[PDB]
Symmetry: C4
């Protein structure tokens, strides 16, 4: 087509720097809205601000959808950028409260826009694929010990191991090692005195696996450097 | 001998993929049996399912024992695969309850069958042999401090250090650092005010050794790469 | 100018070794002043000692400012060395109590003077610049989860998430993993039973990011060695 | 001189393997003596055993001192081997109870005798010298924050920060992160609401330094391999 003009504006630096400025202003706005006193004083300016920024972001997404239609929905950053826009597009009384809490995720658009942020985030995602083998191992391991722990402690201890889900949680807690013994294992042993046969091996296996996953991360990082 | 036929079926992909499907179905079954309501509704279909799958697995192990007899009992994956089959072969009322909880280990047959899982598990086992020197060091160290801590705190504090085993446990807990001070050392110091001479050095030695073991894992991994 | 004499004294070893000896004597002095009994016995000798050492340090800084004026205020070690001198130069009744507690920082002048200490400290500072990308990521992440957690739990749980700052703190605590579950998440779930959807993902993201930052430190260290 | 005979016996394998067997027998003995029931049954055989083994070890040390006099007291393994022998040589009623608890250290003679154990222990000691710079840094840092924390919280909180030593301990506890917040910082903030300015930076500095020390261990290990 002005199509060259609108694609030289959308891909212009000033357009994306401007929506960056709008993102930062909105983040401060969202920070201030937690103050109940600030919300008694300037509750109207901020909400009108939120409305004007949501409309700007929606037209900005419409333009970005136009200038490169096929890529926009095959590109992860813009896909997410479209989804957080959409989630906050549904009016706050049109959705459940949880939708209004998710609206906060619209600040990650700062990670979307800032290219140093893009670089680092896709670096962490890049780490993820090697870990799949040991994540699959470990979630099978957690499933098995959830099952055994439910069937072993979930009547005398229905608070912690009564369910499969409760056992998943208490096992994750034991894995992070928080309160693993004065909190879970010792009270257990007040009734089942060989409960440490279940948990001490569990601790050993889970910690060994975690260490090895970390070392794995490290060598995958280093191989691209020694080459 | 059909011996070529049965060894072209046992070593066929479909046979092992089928027992993989059976393993997954059984894992979901075992997951559902923890629900007491599901067990009131469909307690019979699942138990008949468990019986038909245990017979399939037992004939599958019999065939696998036949086609390569000598290797089957000199191969770790199949050895374990035989043992978990056997453990759940003993009827649930023929054994103690703990046997029924061990039956859950039959889901690790998924690690046995899936070759990506085999690769990663034998990778972790491969890590293990280098660690033997420092494991032997450390268990001697734990034995010595168990002994000293029992003889030092196990009358005024029989809950935690009254025995050698109780001291082993409380020392392992202090090693994982859980509640090491507000939980153990400080209550101790209410009666023995120099108890930190025992535990602070213990903490230092045990943490230093743990770090060094991890670094050791790392360099053993890296040497095979710089070569 | 004696200017050559005073610059051959300031840059002399004995001058800086002497202020090192004075720094150590002052550190022991500061250690002793916490004893209330020692302060009843020799409260006067130590305070006169503090006054004579502060005057020596102030003239030492005046000389060092003279011999190389332009560099002194463009050099970090001496800049800090000037600032800790100044902070304790304000009389103890001229400032708030917090100023008297900051006076203790005058012992880091030992890190300033000792060159092995300088080497190691600037080594740690040298590590810092690479971490900026992931620190910026993470503080955005903490800001977002502070906001969501305040809006989600800060009425039923005003102690922990009532404010943005309180939520920052409780989230940092959950990040260090201290008491994350028996302390925060479980009491929460007594009222909001899906609170683990908020915290378990938070734990996962924050731990993964921390691991990756550490690995990043490591590879940055190693690249200067494989080269 | 038989001097060749006694030096071909002392340096014989059988002599050192025999004292290894004696060390293991004594370790089991020491383990059994914690049982009060075993001590009612066989309290005499074990004590006579302890006496016969202590005499064997003392003559063994006398022989080892003879065959190479100058080296024995310039060699760390044998020096320690001499000292643990001496500590348990003082009769149990001739010393304080703590001496009888130290007698347990005579089991580390197993690390002294076993050469794989020697290899690994001197490997860990070998790691230690590089860490000196950051240990010296850190103990200065701990001294400074002990001082500030005593002067800041040791009247309203004399249990934890009343002394310099108590503050050292509570700071070490905060460093290991155990109960750092629900245990120390939060109760503090009930009276001093900006106590997190002191501890959150302390946590950050101490953790960063710890990470860097570990990375330092790692690169020192790796440089001897890339060479
Ligand atoms: C990216 C991270 C940057 C750094 C983040 C800084 C966060 C600062 C948090 C500290 C603020 C909270 C402390 C505080 O005491 O504030 C009180 C208010 C809420 O209480 P308030 O409503 O004042 O009290 C009500 C009294 N009542 C019930 C009797 C009527 O709470 C407030 O006043 C909230 C103050 C708003 C802080 C907004 C800071 C935004 C930082 C910029 C981040 C933009 C990144 C895109
Ligand atoms: C590939 C990308 C990375 C992703 C990898 C992470 C994989 C996580 C697997 C989680 C699968 C389990 C999820 C699940 O089954 O949810 C169960 C519970 C929910 O409890 P629930 O019963 O809903 O609570 C309601 C309370 N009620 C009924 C009494 C009213 O919720 C929990 O208990 C969840 C607790 C955490 C589970 C962690 C499981 C092991 C993950 C291993 C991660 C690898 C580390 C090396
Ligand atoms: C490998 C890991 C994959 C992901 C694992 C997913 C785990 C999901 C766990 C969450 C389920 C538990 C949550 C929940 O509230 O369920 C309740 C039931 C038990 O309570 P229920 O019997 O319903 O209540 C009794 C009521 N009474 C006493 C008054 C009669 O508890 C249940 O309903 C159990 C539901 C069965 C979940 C089975 C999921 C299997 C995942 C596939 C793994 C196959 C790998 C080979
Ligand atoms: C080579 C492959 C890797 C394997 C390496 C792991 C080595 C583990 C060594 C364990 C040896 C000690 C086992 C033991 O003596 O059991 C004692 C206690 C059992 O307590 P118990 O007295 O049975 O409780 C009954 C209560 N009662 C009598 C009052 C009714 O049970 C416990 O207290 C066990 C607590 C954990 C002990 C950890 C010992 C140090 C292991 C160092 C691991 C290396 C880390 C760097
Ligand atoms: C760099 C680190 C080196 C190693 C640091 C060593 C730190 C030693 C801390 C242990 C001392 C505290 C233990 C203790 O019980 O001392 C008590 C006094 C305070 O209580 P005190 O005033 O004696 O009791 C009052 C009784 N009343 C209320 C009834 C009248 O508290 C004291 O007596 C304080 C004793 C002063 C220790 C000064 C040590 C300085 C180490 C050298 C560091 C110089 C580096 C530049
Ligand atoms: C580049 C050099 C390295 C530096 C990187 C560190 C960045 C730290 C960012 C901190 C920004 C947040 C500061 C802030 O907003 O302060 C809020 C609270 C203060 O609570 P406040 O409301 O003042 O308490 C008064 C109580 N009242 C009102 C009821 C009377 O104070 C807190 O809650 C602070 C708690 C710690 C916050 C940690 C935030 C995430 C940092 C991520 C660090 C990277 C790790 C991978
Ligand atoms: C290097 C590490 C190897 C593995 C270490 C194995 C450690 C085993 C610890 C578990 C034993 C303790 C469990 C237990 O219930 O034993 C009870 C006794 C003490 O209570 P007891 O005196 O039986 O009860 C008194 C009853 N009363 C007051 C009413 C008269 O406590 C005992 O019976 C103690 C049993 C002695 C265990 C000796 C094991 C030595 C392992 C070999 C290490 C040699 C390395 C050089
Ligand atoms: C080169 C080879 C490696 C060695 C490096 C380790 C360096 C350790 C430095 C320790 C210096 C401080 C020792 C000290 O001053 O002792 C003070 C307290 C003793 O408390 P105390 O006042 O005796 O308790 C009596 C109670 N009373 C008076 C009320 C009846 O006892 C404590 O509080 C000690 C707590 C641990 C202190 C840790 C200090 C920082 C060490 C940094 C280690 C490096 C890690 C990166
Ligand atoms: C990233 C990795 C390949 C890249 C590579 O270099 N391989 C070596 C790493 C090992 C990919 C490619 C093939 C992937 C697995 C298979 O789809 C199925 C398998 C089923 C299990 O039930 C649990 C998931 C498993 C482990 C999968 C995830 C894993 O992430 C693998 C190994
Ligand atoms: C894996 C390792 C060798 C492989 C290698 O490359 N060596 C260098 C690693 C050191 C193997 C081979 C020889 C093994 C030791 C001896 O049998 C006895 C010894 C007795 C102690 O009481 C405790 C166990 C000790 C440490 C054993 C375990 C250890 O695991 C060693 C070193
Ligand atoms: C040390 C690093 C460059 C050195 C290097 O080798 N680069 C590769 C490392 C990535 C420096 C140079 C440019 C720096 C960033 C930009 O100023 C802005 C950016 C804005 C975000 O909102 C948060 C801060 C970000 C990430 C900054 C900090 C970061 O520390 C960068 C990457
Ligand atoms: C192992 C290390 C040298 C080996 C090396 O390769 N150097 C580079 C490592 C840095 C040795 C040799 C010189 C040692 C220091 C000085 O005696 C004094 C100094 C005084 C401080 O108040 C605290 C102790 C300091 C840091 C000492 C310990 C440290 O351990 C050093 C650096
Ligand atoms: C079959 C598996 C073989 C068994 C061997 C595997 C090793 C398992 C060790 C036991 C696990 C307990 O794990 C426990 O975790 C805590 C976490 O605070 C460690 O505390 C840690 O401090 C520092 C700082 O992070 C770490 O760098 C270090 O790795 C570790 O010492 C304890 O030192 C460790 O003992
Ligand atoms: C001026 C200094 C610059 C500031 C930057 C330095 C980083 C400091 C991070 C904040 C310190 C809190 O440290 C907190 O320790 C706990 C210990 O369980 C970590 O938990 C850890 O789990 C795994 C398993 O060990 C580690 O490999 C990982 O490094 C870390 O995530 C928390 O994730 C981390 O947040
Ligand atoms: Ca932890
Ligand atoms: Ca821990
Ligand atoms: Ca902990
Ligand atoms: Ca921790
Ligand atoms: Ca810890």
């Amino acid at each position: 087509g002005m199509y060259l003009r609108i694609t030289n504006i959308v891909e212009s630096s000033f357009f994306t720097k401007f929506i960056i400025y709008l993102i930062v202003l909105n983040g401060i706005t969202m920070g201030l809205e937690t103050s109940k006193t600030f919300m008694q004083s300037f509750g109207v300016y901020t909400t009108l601000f939120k409305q004007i920024v949501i409309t700007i972001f929606t037209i900005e997404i419409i333009l970005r959808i136009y200038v490169h239609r096929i890529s926009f929905f095959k590109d992860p950053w813009s896909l997410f950028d479209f989804f957080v826009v959409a989630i906050s597009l549904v009016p706050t009384s049109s959705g459940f409260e949880i939708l209004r809490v998710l609206r906060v995720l619209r600040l990650f658009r700062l990670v979307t826009a800032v290219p140093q942020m893009r670089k680092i985030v896709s670096a962490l995602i890049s780490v993820i694929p090697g870990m799949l083998s040991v994540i699959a191992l470990m979630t099978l391991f957690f499933y098995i010990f959830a099952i055994m722990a439910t069937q072993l402690f979930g009547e005398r201890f229905p608070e912690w191991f009564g369910t499969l889900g409760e056992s998943f949680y208490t096992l994750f807690q034991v894995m992070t090692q928080e309160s693993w013994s004065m909190g879970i294992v010792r009270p257990l042993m007040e009734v089942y005195p060989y409960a440490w046969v279940f948990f001490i091996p569990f601790i050993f296996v889970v910690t060994f696996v975690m260490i090895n996953l970390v070392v794995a991360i490290i060598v995958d990082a280093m191989a691209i450097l020694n080459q």
